[PDB]
Amino acid sequence: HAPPTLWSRVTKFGSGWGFWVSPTVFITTTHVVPTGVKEFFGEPLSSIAIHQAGEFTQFRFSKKMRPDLTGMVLEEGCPEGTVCSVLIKRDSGELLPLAVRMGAIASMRIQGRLVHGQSGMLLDLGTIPGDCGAPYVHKRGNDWVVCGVHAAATKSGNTVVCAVQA
Numbered sequence: 001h002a003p004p005t006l007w008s009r010v011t012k013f014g015s016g017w018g019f020w021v022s023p024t025v026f027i028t029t030t031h032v033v034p035t036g037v038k039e040f041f042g043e044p045l046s047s048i049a050i051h052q053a054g055e056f057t058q059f060r061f062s063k064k065m066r067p068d069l070t071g072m073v074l075e076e077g078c079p080e081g082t083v084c085s086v087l088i089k090r091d092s093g094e095l096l097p098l099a100v101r102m103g104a105i106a107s108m109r110i111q112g113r114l115v116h117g118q119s120g121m122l123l124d125l126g127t128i129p130g131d132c133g134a135p136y137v138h139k140r141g142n143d144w145v146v147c148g149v150h151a152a153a154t155k156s157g158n159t160v161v162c163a164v165q166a
Contacts, residue, residue, distance in 0.1 A: 002087060002097055002137070006144055009069065010089050010135065017089060017133035018057075021146060022071035023064035028133040029149045029163055030057045031113065041065055054107070054116025055151050055163035073140075077118050077164035078102040078147035084120070084136045086150060086160070091130060099123040100136065100160055102147075108161065110152045117151055117161040126157030136162045 009020040018028030026041075030052050038044055040059060049060040078084055080102060088096040100120035108115040120136075127134075127150060136148040148162025 002085060002144070005069070006137070007087060007089070007095055009066070010087050012089070013133060015132070016130060016150075017135075019087070019133070019135035019146060019149065020066045020069055021074050023066045023069050024061045025071075025074070026059040026061070026065070027074070027135070027146070027149055028057050028059075029151045030055045031151075032132045033057055053166050054114055055110075056116060056149065056165050058165070073143065073145045074165065075145055075147040076166065077105045078120075078136060078138070078162070080104060082138050083123065084138045084147065086127070086131075086134050086136055086162075088127065088131050088134045088150075090128075096125060098125060098127070098160075102136075105164060108152075110161070115151055115161060115163055116166060117163050118148055120160050120162070122158055122160060127153045127160055 014032040014034040016032035051058045086098040103119040105118045134150040148164045151163040152161040
């Protein structure tokens with residue numbers, strides 16, 4: 001079960017969400033990033049290192065934005081066959097951890113976007129268009145790990161796709 005501090009890392013951002021990996025590192029899905037702004041979280045862009053590839057966006061800030069947090073491991077994709085939790089927040093405030101059995105990493109073209117992503121089967125509650133950037137996480141021993149951010153789902157909703165770090 002995900003504890004409150006972990007949920008407190010899931011953050012409304014743009015047209016979806018993003019996730020504080022550490023006091024200084026925030027990840028989200030590229031296409032939810034708001035366009036035509038000069039600052040994220042009150043910091044100007046000249047102050048932020050931004051790595052974007054394949055619908056995976058990473059901000060590294062120059063100050064501690066969330067000093068209440070410890071740093072967590074960010075993996076380059078989820079281990080195939082691991083059951084992750086998708087830490088979905090809804091605009092209502094409802095928390096919706098969705099269990100997903102992760103599959104293979106793959107390049108994909110989704111409505112024209114190059115997605116470096118990982119498919120998963122949802123294990124009735126699905127994702128919605130407002131959920132992108134929600135983190136995919138799992139517990140390894142005693143610690144939670146993050147491995148992707150929500151990016152797409154199929155028409156039925158039974159299969160989801162998170163973007164993963166190169």
